[PDB]
Symmetry: C2
Subunit: 211 residues, 2 copies
Amino acid sequence: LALSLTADQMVSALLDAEPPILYSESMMGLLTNLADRELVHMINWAKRVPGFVDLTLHDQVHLLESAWLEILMIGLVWRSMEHPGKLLFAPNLLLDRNQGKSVEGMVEIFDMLLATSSRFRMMNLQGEEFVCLKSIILLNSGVYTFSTLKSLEEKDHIHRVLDKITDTLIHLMAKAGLTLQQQHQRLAQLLLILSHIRHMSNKGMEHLYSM
Amino acid sequence: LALSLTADQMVSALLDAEPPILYSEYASMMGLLTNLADRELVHMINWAKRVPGFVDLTLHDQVHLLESAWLEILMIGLVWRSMEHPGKLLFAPNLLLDRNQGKSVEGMVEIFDMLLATSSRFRMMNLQGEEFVCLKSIILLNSGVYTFLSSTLKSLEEKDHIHRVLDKITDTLIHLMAKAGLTLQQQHQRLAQLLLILSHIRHMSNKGMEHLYSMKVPLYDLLLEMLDAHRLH
Ligand SMILES: Oc1ccc([C@@H]2Oc3cccc(O)c3[C@@H]3CCC[C@@H]32)cc1
Ligand SMILES: Oc1ccc([C@@H]2Oc3cccc(O)c3[C@@H]3CCC[C@@H]32)cc1
């Protein structure tokens, strides 16, 4: 099981499961089409996340239905890091704030995504940390919304895996040369950003469902 | 000055700052819940002003943070006092409601279930009072930090301060866990478990806002009115 993997094995498995960066094939049309194609790759990526396939199909579907937008958004923010002021939806679709005003209700979300990307840049987020965070989102997002006996076991499994990913993040920070205090401070800084990603996803859904 | 406090002083400060538990007044379930939340807001501002470092910020930034986090703060408070009442939500000592009593208002039951699950999680983790106050302060400082308007030197200075205080609370959380006898690995694991729940609290607040808006002076001006006090008294 995933509970037996080592910190380096975890990082390795995660880096390998990384989906491909797709290209865009009016604006909403392009964003949703892109999202639709990425979803297919997300599902394959998910199954590769240590511990995911150990859950019931029903629960696998639940976690994905709950975390897909947060997962797409953290990916967007990650590839937009080296591009201050712009969101790299796709290599051939790099948009700025003004282009966001185009659609209604869209710029407010663009601004939050931009701010998040800036925070990651400021923190100098590493690719190893990024994959860990994305996996955390997948497992954490829908766990608080699955009282049956079967649920107990599922949740227990999820939490153990999450603990493993936490150890991995800490491990990465240790090898990076951070002091213990710096380590736990960065761990918290990174997890607190997940709350903002949840927020952006909620708003993204409000914007999506509003049309 | 808040950045020089020790872990123990940080904890004592937060504990001392705790707001009072209000009673429901008296039925319109929403009327009761909203009136209760309205009266608690007044006390929330007093509590916020007592959170180390909060008053060093500008009035504008203080209002923005509270406008962003008020419902999360009310909800974590609710979940906290509901910990000893499995299956029920203790909105107030005289307003303990169960799941079915939530079906009396469309779209309320889904939120109730989320709050109830959060309460069970806290109970399952044996959340400590010292940890609860640290978490509530983190919500206050973190929820709206990523949505600050300007990027002026002043703004950059405020964000630096907020992140510095947040690091301090993180230090305090780890200190509490260390004194509890947990190993370093258990400390890091619990810290993560606690912070991930804030993601769920953020989620509930958003669903709560959507619900509140389904049943519509702007909140900002109301918070500003109360935060912008004079010194004649
Ligand atoms: O990889 C990605 C990441 C984000 C997007 C897009 O992000 C945004 C951002 C702002 C407003 C939106 O409606 C969307 C839509 C809503 C669904 C997602 C899609 C598309 C592809
Ligand atoms: O201390 C507290 C905590 C929560 C509440 C109530 O919590 C809920 C829960 C579910 C649906 C709601 O509309 C509310 C309303 C929306 C505003 C808050 C209020 C009231 C007082």
